[model samples]
Target chain A: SKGDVNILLNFRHNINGEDLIIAVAQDHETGEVLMVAYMNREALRRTLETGTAHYWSTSRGKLWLKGESSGHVQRVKDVLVDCDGDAVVLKVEQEGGACHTGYRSCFYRSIDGDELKVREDAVKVFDP
Target chain B: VNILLNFRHNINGEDLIIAVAQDHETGEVLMVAYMNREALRRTLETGTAHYWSTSRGKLWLKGESSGHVQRVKDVLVDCDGDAVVLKVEQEGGACHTGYRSCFYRSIDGDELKVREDAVKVFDP
Candidate 1:
């Protein structure tokens, strides 16, 4: 009832022109967080319409379809919005890896003090 | 490698970004919040979760009143360095609504269902 597409209209768009909501992609099976990105209305609409992950690149200032270039697309299985509409999580079946650096998830490196250590379980599927 | 030096705080109009608190061993996302520079620094120093309360318009130590504090086990940054994941040992409940996780609802098209595993830590 409260978790429909209409919630998108009330999402807190607090970036660029307040048109972007924080979008997180998590592995549907493993519950592993793959990555975090921003999604404009068009990107969210596209993802919902196509049942895939789409994001807005602040640096590129354009819509980005996950795995568009690397073929690492995420097939969205479920969408969960937070108590507040500022954020969203997409449970997805990820294809290939989710990071450009070849890692299965963007959160491959653990921060211990000032050092960044790669997790042992972090799988690298490609060469950056 | 330096999170403080390299994090892109300027991406948002304010110096805050999304911070996700997740269960350390289970990888269950507990809650979503925002953290500014001070909040992040305090979290690292205290080994507890802190956030920038958008509604309160100030810094907040999570579980300040609820006693459901999140003890940071590890911190991870995303590929773009804009968002962070806080792997933590959650105490009590992470959701003020009493659910262990804020993400207790699953959306199926126009329908919403509360996950069976979603337990209420306390009734509000």
Candidate 2:
């Protein structure tokens, strides 16, 4: 089942039942992190097979193909499994943008006063 | 192994959180660390990166002994707040192997390629 290795590989407790990997998506060029999502074994298998990003939507309770609707496809270049193989990193060429605000990355804001403040330096993004 | 719909204190009750640390200026990921709640609270309060060192069996500060201090610029908690991405400005490199990033090598097909050279140390 070549999924991301055991959940307890590095962590103190055993994260076993669900069998999901914490997948962080990063812009290949900027090295800026784009977003974070969970990938089940099915999503991981598809990502490896297709070289595209796939994630599990916990709210929607289903598999989601990144940019399927917005066309902001995440073309993965390389997949790195961590030392303990508990997590996954996707070096990707993100098309268009990587945010609901259309910002280059979802993390365009910084936390302040327990709320996210839109950074003035952030590229003015639009909602799709 | 329940896939958390909510990030409310799950993941082995403080055993794991995707602790990602990056260079704030270069946006280069220096290291991707993992930690528990005990470590995370210290990270935010102290403005330094702390992680649960499962290997060392204790809470570890990024530059505790190496002096490659990582001054945290910002921390982002995803929808569930399970994984945290820490943006920082580092003093030196961030690898035990003397590389700037823990991810100094690239996984190419079945082989590995050293993309970044091993760096110098400021202290320790």
Candidate number with greatest TM-score:
1
**Interface RMSD of candidate number 2:** 5.7
TM-score chain B for all models. Answer: 0.88, 0.80
lDDT per residue (tens digit) for residues A49-92 in model 2: 67889987765767789998888889999766554345667899
Give the true-structure RMSD of model 2: 5.3
lDDT of 1 at A119: 82
lDDT of 2 by residue, B1-124 (tens): 1232123424434556667887788776667767776676677788888887755768899889978778888876554446667889887778776667766665455444566443444333
The TM-score between candidate 1 and the true structure equals 0.90
Models, CA RMSD each: 2.5, 5.3
Error of 2 at A117 (Å): 1.1
Looking at model 1 chain A, report the run of 10 residues with the lowest lDDT sum: A1-10
Candidate 2 yields a Cα-based lDDT of 0.68
DockQ of each model vs. true complex: 0.54, 0.27
